Write a protein that binds this DNA or RNA. Structure first.
Length: 175
RNA sequence: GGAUGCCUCCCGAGUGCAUCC
């Protein structure tokens, strides 16, 4: 994995995420509002995309130039409530079914990493979903790759974490 | 003649599908 695997490829890295748009009027509109703004703000919004019906909106800046001017002209705001400007992403966890991952179904409503990592081994990302606040009885895990995923998967596929031989399917694809 | 269910964990998530009554 020299250097890296997946990376960004656009006009310029200068990016920025917009959170807290307030899903009241209409996200689509909220994102646009910020758009038209970037247009009448004397510049050319490099990137402009949305994320999940009501998650957030991403955007790229022409460069320190257009970026500087923007920051200087706070204003922005969807309509009334302010928003958050920052780009912590750097990757993609959604719309990627966790490429090279493995989800575990059927839980004991009291499992953790002990029994989890216990059944698995090549699991780089161990996470369980089931703890009060509306139980679920389902755990999720990620693998450094599909190779180890399929192997371990089909392997532990038949275990016994809750007297029901916990479930474990694959999730993702490749890229 | 009728209609809906689902994709968990996880900051870009929507070229999204199936069957039943």
């Amino acid at each position: 994995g020299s250097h890296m695997v997946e990376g960004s490829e656009s006009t310029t890295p200068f990016n920025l995420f917009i959170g807290n748009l307030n899903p009241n009027k209409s996200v689509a509109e909220l994102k646009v509002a910020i758009s038209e703004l970037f247009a009448k703000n004397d510049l050319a919004v490099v990137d402009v995309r949305t994320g999940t019906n009501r998650k957030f909106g991403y955007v790229d800046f022409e460069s320190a130039e257009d970026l500087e001017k923007a920051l200087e002209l706070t204003g922005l705001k969807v309509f009334g409530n302010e928003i958050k400007l920052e780009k912590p992403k750097g990757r993609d966890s959604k719309k990627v079914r966790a490429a090279r991952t493995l989800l575990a179904k059927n839980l004991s409503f009291n499992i953790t990493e002990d029994e989890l990592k216990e059944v698995f081994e090549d699991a780089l990302e161990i996470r369980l979903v089931s703890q009060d606040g509306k139980s679920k009885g389902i755990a999720y895990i990620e693998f450094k790759s599909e190779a180890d995923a399929e192997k371990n998967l089909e392997e532990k596929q038949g275990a016994e974490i809750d007297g029901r031989s916990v479930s474990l399917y694959y999730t993702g694809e490749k890229g």
